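RETRY 2/3 - previous attempt timed out on the joint model. Re-submitting the same 1456-residue input unchanged.
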Amino acid sequence: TATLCLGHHSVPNGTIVKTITDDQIEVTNATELVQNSSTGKICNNPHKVLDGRDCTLIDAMLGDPHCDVFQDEKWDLFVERSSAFSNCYPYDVPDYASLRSLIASSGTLDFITESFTWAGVSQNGGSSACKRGPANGFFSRLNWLTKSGSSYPLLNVTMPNNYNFDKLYIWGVHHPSTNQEQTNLYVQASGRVTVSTRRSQQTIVPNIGSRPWVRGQSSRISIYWTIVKPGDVLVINSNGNLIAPRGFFKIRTGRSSIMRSDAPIETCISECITPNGSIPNDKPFQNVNKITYGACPKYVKQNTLKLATGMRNVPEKQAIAGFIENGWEGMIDGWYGFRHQNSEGTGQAADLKSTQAAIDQINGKLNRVIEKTNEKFHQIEKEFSEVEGRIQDLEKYVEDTKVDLWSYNAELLVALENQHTIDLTDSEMNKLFEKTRRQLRENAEDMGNGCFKIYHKCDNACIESIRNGTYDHDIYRDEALNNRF
Amino acid sequence: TATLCLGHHSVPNGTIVKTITDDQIEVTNATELVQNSSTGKICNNPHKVLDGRDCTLIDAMLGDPHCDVFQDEKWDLFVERSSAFSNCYPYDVPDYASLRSLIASSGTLDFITESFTWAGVSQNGGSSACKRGPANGFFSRLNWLTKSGSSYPLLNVTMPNNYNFDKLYIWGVHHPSTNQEQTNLYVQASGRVTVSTRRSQQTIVPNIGSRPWVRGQSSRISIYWTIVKPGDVLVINSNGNLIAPRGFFKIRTGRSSIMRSDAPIETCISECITPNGSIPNDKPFQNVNKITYGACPKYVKQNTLKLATGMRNVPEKQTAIAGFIENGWEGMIDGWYGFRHQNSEGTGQAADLKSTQAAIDQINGKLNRVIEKTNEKFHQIEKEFSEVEGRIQDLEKYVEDTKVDLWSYNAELLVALENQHTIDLTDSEMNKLFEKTRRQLRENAEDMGNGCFKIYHKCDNACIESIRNGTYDHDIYRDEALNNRF
Amino acid sequence: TATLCLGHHSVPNGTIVKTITDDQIEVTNATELVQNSSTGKICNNPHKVLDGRDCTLIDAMLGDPHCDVFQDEKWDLFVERSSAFSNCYPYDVPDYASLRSLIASSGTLDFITESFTWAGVSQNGGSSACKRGPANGFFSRLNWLTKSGSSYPLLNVTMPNNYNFDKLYIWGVHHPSTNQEQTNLYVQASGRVTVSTRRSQQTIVPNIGSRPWVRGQSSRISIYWTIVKPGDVLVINSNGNLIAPRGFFKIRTGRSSIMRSDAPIETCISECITPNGSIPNDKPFQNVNKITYGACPKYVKQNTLKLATGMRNVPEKQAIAGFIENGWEGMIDGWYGFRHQNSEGTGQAADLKSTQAAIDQINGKLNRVIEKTNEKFHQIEKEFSEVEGRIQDLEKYVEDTKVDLWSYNAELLVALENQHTIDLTDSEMNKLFEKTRRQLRENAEDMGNGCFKIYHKCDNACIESIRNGTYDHDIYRDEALNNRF
Ligand SMILES: *[C@@H]1O[C@H](CO)[C@@H](O[C@@H]2O[C@H](CO)[C@@H](O[C@@H]3O[C@H](CO[C@H]4O[C@H](CO)[C@@H](O)[C@H](O)[C@@H]4O)[C@@H](O)[C@H](O[C@H]4O[C@H](CO)[C@@H](O)[C@H](O)[C@@H]4O)[C@@H]3O)[C@H](O)[C@H]2NC(C)=O)[C@H](O)[C@H]1NC(C)=O
Ligand SMILES: *[C@@H]1O[C@H](CO)[C@@H](O[C@@H]2O[C@H](CO)[C@@H](O[C@@H]3O[C@H](CO[C@H]4O[C@H](CO)[C@@H](O)[C@H](O)[C@@H]4O)[C@@H](O)[C@H](O[C@H]4O[C@H](CO)[C@@H](O)[C@H](O)[C@@H]4O)[C@@H]3O)[C@H](O)[C@H]2NC(C)=O)[C@H](O)[C@H]1NC(C)=O
Ligand SMILES: *[C@@H]1O[C@H](CO)[C@@H](O[C@@H]2O[C@H](CO)[C@@H](O[C@@H]3O[C@H](CO[C@H]4O[C@H](CO)[C@@H](O)[C@H](O)[C@@H]4O)[C@@H](O)[C@H](O[C@H]4O[C@H](CO)[C@@H](O)[C@H](O)[C@@H]4O)[C@@H]3O)[C@H](O)[C@H]2NC(C)=O)[C@H](O)[C@H]1NC(C)=O
Ligand SMILES: CC(=O)N[C@H]1[C@H]([C@H](O)[C@H](O)CO)O[C@@](OC[C@H]2O[C@@H](O)[C@H](O)[C@@H](O)[C@H]2O)(C(=O)O)C[C@@H]1O
Ligand SMILES: CC(=O)N[C@H]1[C@H]([C@H](O)[C@H](O)CO)O[C@@](OC[C@H]2O[C@@H](O)[C@H](O)[C@@H](O)[C@H]2O)(C(=O)O)C[C@@H]1O
Ligand SMILES: CC(=O)N[C@H]1[C@H]([C@H](O)[C@H](O)CO)O[C@@](OC[C@H]2O[C@@H](O)[C@H](O)[C@@H](O)[C@H]2O)(C(=O)O)C[C@@H]1O
Ligand SMILES: *[C@@H]1O[C@H](CO)[C@@H](O[C@@H]2O[C@H](CO)[C@@H](O)[C@H](O)[C@H]2NC(C)=O)[C@H](O)[C@H]1NC(C)=O
Ligand SMILES: *[C@@H]1O[C@H](CO)[C@@H](O[C@@H]2O[C@H](CO)[C@@H](O)[C@H](O)[C@H]2NC(C)=O)[C@H](O)[C@H]1NC(C)=O
Ligand SMILES: *[C@@H]1O[C@H](CO)[C@@H](O[C@@H]2O[C@H](CO)[C@@H](O)[C@H](O)[C@H]2NC(C)=O)[C@H](O)[C@H]1NC(C)=O
Ligand SMILES: *[C@@H]1O[C@H](CO)[C@@H](O)[C@H](O)[C@H]1NC(C)=O
Ligand SMILES: *[C@@H]1O[C@H](CO)[C@@H](O)[C@H](O)[C@H]1NC(C)=O
Ligand SMILES: *[C@@H]1O[C@H](CO)[C@@H](O)[C@H](O)[C@H]1NC(C)=O
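RETRY 2/3 succeeded.
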C-alpha cells in the first residue's frame, strides 16, 4: 500500500488581522494600509513650492518693503511661516479670508502698471511706519493721494478693459484719527470713495477716531478689491481719503493653493505635501494630517489597518498528516503540495497551479474597489486661530462628517477583504483535495485527516502520475479491489 | 450500463463584469446601471415648467416692462436662459443670490396692492431708460417718490399684518450721481431710509458719485426686502431717496426651484429634469449632470457599471458526453441547468426547472434589497458659478465634491459585491444539484470525475425520467449494480 | 443495524429578516438595531443641564431684570424653552446666531467688573421699559451714558489685557427715534462709536427714525461684541450714542452647547439628550431626532432594522429524519445534536463544540465594524424659524447629505451581516455532517436525508464513542462489509 497527504505551508511568525466573523486571526503575511509617519521635510519637486520667509501672501501682494523680493512671482503651493510679520502702515482687510483664498488660487503676482491721471492732488505719500532704507515709504502697489496747495478737487477717472482677461484692482481708504488730521490731509471735513463698474458698486465713508498705537500710527487703512470683466469699464470717484491703485493684477485659473507650515524645504521628489512634510502615496490611507496638497492618501482616524495577503497560519502538531488542523513548515517551493509515504521512502513535492491561482487572486485585490489616488489642490480651511461663529462651525461640521464617513468605509473594506481572502484560500485547498479524490475512483479511501490510503503498490512514477493528472485507475482496479475487500 | 451528465447553458457572446476577486470575468448576461445620455429636451409633464425666455426671475418680480407677461405666475421649476437681459433702470441687489433663492423657493409671483398714503410728495416717477411703449416708465411693482413743489416732508407710514400668512415687501433706495441731482430730486442734501418691524430694522444712507453709463443713466438703485409675520407691523420712515413699495408678495412653502438651461421644452412625460434635458429614472445612477430636479438617479463619476445577471460563460470544448467541469452546454435553450444521458436507446437532453427557477428568483430583484427605489430632491444649493467670491463658494464646491466622491465609491463597491454574490450563488446551485443527484444514487453509480455519473445497470428512458423526477429507487437495482461493479 | 441522524433546533415562533440574496427569510432569533422611542424627560446626570425657564441665553448674558438669577452660571447644556420672553429695552443683535453660538460654546457666564472712567458724562441711565422692581432700570451688564449738564465731551478710554486668557466685551449703540431726542440725550447732532484693538476695528453710526412701539419705546439698541487677546489693548472712542460695558466675560474652550426643547427635567442617568428627551445608547442607530448631545446613536431614516442572531427556522415535518429540509423543535439543550435509533431504543443528544463555535462567531459580530458610540457636543443648527437664504440652504443640504449616506450605510451593513450569519450557520451544520461521515469510513452510507445507516450492531456505548470521536472502524469493518454485500 501507500499513503498520500495534502497540506499547506506555514510560517514561524504570523500576523494578526481582523475579519467579519473573527475578532483576531493569525495569517502568514499581511501589509499595512495606513501611512502614519513623515520625514519632516517638504520636497521641491514636482510642484513649484514658494517659501514665504517673513512675509504673508497679502503683505507680498501689497508691496511691503521687506517683501519686495516676491514681485511678479508664481507658485503651485505657497508656504506661510508662523514667524511672518508686518512692517508697514497698519491696515485691516474686511473679508480677509476671501481675498487671501482668491489670491492663493490665482497662483501669480503679475502686476501691470497703468497710467492713471490724478489732477489737482499730490501723489506718492509716505510715512515713517513704512521705511524704504533711510527715507519714508509706502506700499509699492498703492498710491497715497493728499491735498495739493490748499485744495482737494473731486476725482473722477475711468479706465476700460480692452483685453481678453479679467483684471483685479486693489485700492484702499484712509481712516484718520482726529478731525484736525482729516482736515489737514484732505480739505473736506468728510471724505467719500466710490468704485464701480457696469454691474457692481462700492462706497466707503471713512471713520474718524483714536486707535491703539502701531509703529507710531493711530490711523488705519482698509483694503478693498474689484474685478473688471473684459469689455467692462472701471470708474473711480472720490472726495478724499482715497488710496489709489497703481495698476491691476492678472488673475488666472489653475491648481494653486496656500499652506501654513514650519517644515524646511529640501531637494527631493514627492507628490503629496502636508504641514508635517511630504509623505509617500503608495498606501490608500494616511493618518498624518487632514490638510493635504496633491495626490495624497485619504485621511482616516485609525492608526493601523492590516490587510491579509496570505492564508491562515496553523502550527504543525507533533506517520505523515494532512491539512486537517495541521500546517507544514517544511514547504518552501509553494503554498500547496503533496507528501507521500512509499515503499521506496518518504517524499514531498509542491503544486504550482493552485498556488499560482491563489497568488493571482490575492495580487491587486484592493485595486478593484478603491481608486489609486485622488488629486485635490485647493480646499477649505481646516484650522482656525480666532472664533467667528456660524461659518467656522459649518466648516468644522463638514470636515468631521467627511472624516467619520471615510474612516467607516476603510474599516468595512478591510474587514470584507480579509474575510474573502481567508475564504478563497480555504476554497483552493478544498478544491485541490476534491480533485485528488476524484482522480482516484475506488483505489483509495479517505483516512479522515486530509490523507489518502492507496490500496495498491504505488511507486514514485505512480505518485508522479497522480500529481500530474494522468493517473489511470483501471490499471490497479483489480488489485485495489482485492486488497480493500 | 448508462451515462448521466450534469451541465449548464452558455451563450455565443458574453459580457465582461468585475467582481471582488476577479477584475475581468465573462458572464452570460449583464445590465447597465449608469444613465449617460439625454434627449436634449425638457418635458413639461408632470412638473409645471415656466420658460423665462429673455427675463430673469428678479426682473420678472420687479416688473420690467418687457417682463410684464409674467405677472401673477406659478411654477414648479423656473428655467432661466442665457440670453436674458435687463431693459429698465440700472440697479443692484445686495445679497442677490439669497433673494433669488427665496423667490424661487416661494414658487409664486402673487402680488396684492395695498393703500399706501404718501403726503406731500410726487408719485409715479419715470425715466427714459425704462420705456413703457412710447412714454417713460418704471418698475411696475415699485413707486418712485420725488419732491412736490419745493418741499420733501418727512414720511412716516405704517401697515399692519392682519392676515394669517407672511408678507414680503420689496423696496429700494436711489443713489444720485451728483450733489446737485440729489438736491434737485429731494430737498434734503442727505437722504435716509428706515424700514423696521417689531423685531428687525434696516437703515440705508444713499451714496453720491459717478458711475458708468448704463442706458443713459449714471445713477443706481439698490433693492432690499423685508418679511412681516402675522400680527406684526411694518413702519417706513424716510426723508429722501425712497423707492416705495406698492404692496406685498405672498410667500409660500413648497417644492419649487430655479434652473439655468438652454434646452427647448417639448410635450412629453418625465420625472427628472437636468440642464442637458430630461432623463429616464429607471437606473439607480446617472452621469449626465450633478444638477437635478425631481425623482432622479444619484450622480456618480463612473461612465459605466455592469451588473451581472446570468452565470459564468464557459465555452464548449470541441472534442462521448461531458459534464459541467470546465465545459458549458451550447445546445440548451429551455433552461439554465439540465441532464444529458447516454443510453442503449440513444442520447437525450432535458432541463431542471426547480434549480433554474430558484436561481432566477434569487437574481431577480437583487439590487432593490439595498438601494432605495428613487430619491426626490427639489431645491438644493447652487453648483455652478460665473464669478469668484471666496469662502462660501469654496465651501459649496467642497461639499459637492465630497458628496460625489462618497457616492461614487459606494456605487463601485456595491456593484463588485453584487457580482461576486451572483457568481457564488450560481456555482452553489450547480453544486447542490450535482450533490442531490449523487445522493439519489447510493451504490449503483460512481462519479466519473468530469461532472458525469456512470450507472452500472440497464437504465432505460423510464429509469432516467425517474432519476430526474426524484423518485428513483435503488433497492431494485442494487444487486445488479453491485454484481456489475465487482 | 442502526440509524444515526444529524439535525438542528427550531423554535415555534420565528422572526423575518432581510439578507443580500433574500427579500424575507425566517430565523430563530433577532434583535432590533434602531431606537425609536423616548421617555419624554431629560435626565440631569451626568451632564450639567441648566433650565432657561422664561429666559434666553442672550437675555441672561445681557442682564435682563427677570433673568438676574442666571448671573455667574455654568452649564454643559443650556435648555431654551419656547415660552421665553424679553422684558427690557427693545434691542437687536446683528449676527445674532454667531453670538448665541459663541456664548453657548463658551459654557459660562462669569463676569469681572472693571473700573472704567467716563469723565464729563452721567451714568446709570434707566427707562420705564425695564423696571427693577418699583424703579426704572436697565441691563445689569451695560452702562447707559448721557450728557452731563449741557455738554457731552469726546470719550477716549483704554483698557489693556494683562492676563493670560481672552476677554469678551459686550457694548451697544443707541438709535434715537427723532432728531430732537438725539439732541436732548446727546449734544452732538450725529453720534459715533469706535471700538478697536491692535488688529481689528469697528465703527457704528447711529440711525434716527421712528420704529414700532415696543413696551412704550420707539427707539432701539444694537449689540456688538469684541474679543481682546492676551497682551493686546482695547480702545473705546465715541462722542455720543454709546452703551458702555461694565467689564468682560471670561471665555473658555470646552464641550458646552445649547438646545431648544420643552421636555421637563427629572432625576435620572442618561448619556444622550434629544429635544424629545433622553434615550438609551445601547443601540447603534436611532430614529428619534437628528439633534443630539453627548454619546448618541447615529440618526437614520429607517424606523426598524432587524439583525439575525440565530439560524434559519425550518418547521419539523410529519422514523427519524435529519437536517435535510427538517428542523427539530424537541431539542432545547443545544443548537446541533444527534438522534439515533437502536435495538435498545431511540435517544437524543446535543453537540456542544459546534454550538459553542457558532455562538462565539455570532456574539459580538456588529462590534467588529462599527464603533460603540460617537461623542458630539457642539454642532450646527438644524431647525430654523425664519427664512434667510444661502447659509440656511447650505446647512440643510449638508445635513440631508449626511443623513442619506448614513442610512445607506446602515442598510447595507445589516444586509451583509444577516447574509454572513446564515452562511456561517449552514457551514457549521455541513461541517458537522462531514466530520461524522469521515469518522465512519466504510461501515455506513448516507441515505440522503441527513442521516447515516450503520451496518453493524451499535449500542449506546458505540453511539457515545461516535459522538466523542473515539470510534474505531477496524473493529466492525468485517461485519459491516459482510452486511453491506
Ligand atoms: C486716546 O487714548 C489712547 C490710549 O490711551 C491714546 O493713545 C496713546 O497715545 C500716546 C501718545 O499720545 C502713546 O504714547 C506713546 O507710546 C509709544 C509706545 O510706547 C511703548 O514703547 C515705549 C518705548 O519702547 C515704552 O516705554 C512704553 O511702555 C510702551 O511699551 C512711545 O514710544 C511714545 O514715546 C514718545 O513720546 C514720549 C513722550 O515723553 C517721548 O519721550 C519719546 O521719546 C517718544 O517721542 C509715546 O509715549 C500711547 O502708547 C498710546 N496708547 C495706546 C494704547 O495706543 C491716544 O493718544 C488718546 N487720544 C487723545 C486724543 O487723547
Ligand atoms: C466722470 O467720468 C465718467 C467716465 O469718463 C463720465 O461718464 C461719461 O459721461 C459721458 C457724458 O457726460 C458719456 O458720453 C455719452 O456716451 C453715450 C454712449 O456712448 C456710446 O455710444 C455711442 C453711440 O452709440 C458711441 O459712439 C460711443 O463710442 C459709446 O459706445 C453717448 O450716446 C452720449 O452721446 C451724447 O452726447 C453727444 C455729444 O455730441 C450727443 O451728440 C448725443 O446726442 C448724446 O446727447 C455721450 O457721448 C460717457 O459714455 C460716460 N462714460 C462712462 C464710462 O460712463 C462722467 O460724465 C464723469 N463725470 C463728471 C462729473 O465729469
Ligand atoms: C410714525 O408712525 C408710527 C405708526 O403709526 C407712530 O407710532 C405710533 O405712535 C403712537 C403714539 O404714541 C402710539 O400710540 C400709543 O399706543 C400705545 C399702545 O397701544 C396699544 O395698547 C393699548 C393698550 O393695551 C390698546 O388700547 C391699543 O389699541 C394698542 O393695542 C398706547 O398705550 C398709547 O396710549 C397712550 O396715549 C393715549 C393718548 O390718549 C393715552 O390715553 C394713554 O393713557 C397712553 O398714555 C398710545 O396710544 C402707537 O401705538 C404707535 N404705533 C406703532 C405701530 O408703533 C409714530 O408715533 C409716528 N411718528 C411720528 C413722529 O409721528
Ligand atoms: C502722506 C502724508 O501726509 N504723510 C505724512 C504722515 C501723515 O501726515 C500721517 O501719518 C497720517 O496719519 O505723517 C508723517 O509724520 C508723522 C508725524 O507728523 C507730525 O505732524 C506729528 O506732530 C508727529 O507726532 C508725527 O505723527 C509720518 O511720517 O507718518 C509725515 C508724512 O509726510
Ligand atoms: C422721477 C424723475 O424725476 N424722473 C426724471 C429723471 C431723473 O431726473 C433722473 O433720471 C434722476 O437721475 O430724468 C429724466 O431725464 C433725464 C435727463 O434729465 C435732464 O435734466 C438732463 O439734462 C438730461 O441729460 C437727461 O439726463 C429721465 O428720463 O431719466 C426725466 C425724468 O422725468
Ligand atoms: C437715560 C435716559 O435719558 N432715560 C430716560 C428715557 C429716555 O429719555 C428715552 O427713553 C430715550 O428714548 O426716557 C424715560 O422717559 C420716557 C418718557 O419721556 C418723556 O420725556 C416723554 O414725553 C414720554 O412720552 C415718555 O417717552 C423712560 O422712562 O424711558 C425717562 C428716562 O430717565
Ligand atoms: C502632524 O502635525 C499635526 C499638527 O497639526 C499634529 O497634530 C497635533 O498633535 C499634537 C500632539 O499630539 C496635538 O496636541 C494637537 O492637538 C494636534 N493637532 C491637531 C489639529 O490634531 C500631528 O500629531 C502630526 N503628526 C505627525 C505624524 O507628526
Ligand atoms: C451635460 O451638460 C454639461 C454642461 O455643464 C456638460 O459638461 C461639460 O462638458 C464639456 C464637454 O466635455 C466640458 O468641456 C465642460 O467642462 C463640462 N462642464 C462641466 C461643468 O462639467 C456635460 O458633458 C453634458 N453631458 C451630456 C451627456 O450631454
Ligand atoms: C421628536 O420631536 C420631533 C420634533 O421636531 C418630532 O418631529 C416632528 O413630528 C411631527 C409629528 O409627526 C411632524 O409633524 C413634524 O414635521 C416633525 N418635525 C420634524 C423636523 O421632523 C418627532 O416626531 C419626535 N419623535 C418622537 C419619537 O417623539
Ligand atoms: C508579504 O506580502 C508582501 C506584499 O504582498 C510581499 O512583498 C512580501 O514578500 C510577502 N512576504 C513573504 C514572506 O512572502
Ligand atoms: C438579460 O437580462 C435582462 C434583464 O435582466 C433581460 O431583459 C434580457 O432578456 C436578458 N438577456 C437574455 C438573453 O435573456
Ligand atoms: C435572542 O438574542 C438575544 C441577544 O442575543 C438574547 O438576549 C435572547 O435571549 C435570545 N433569545 C432566545 C430565545 O434565546
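Chain B has seven helices and 36 strands. Closing ticket.
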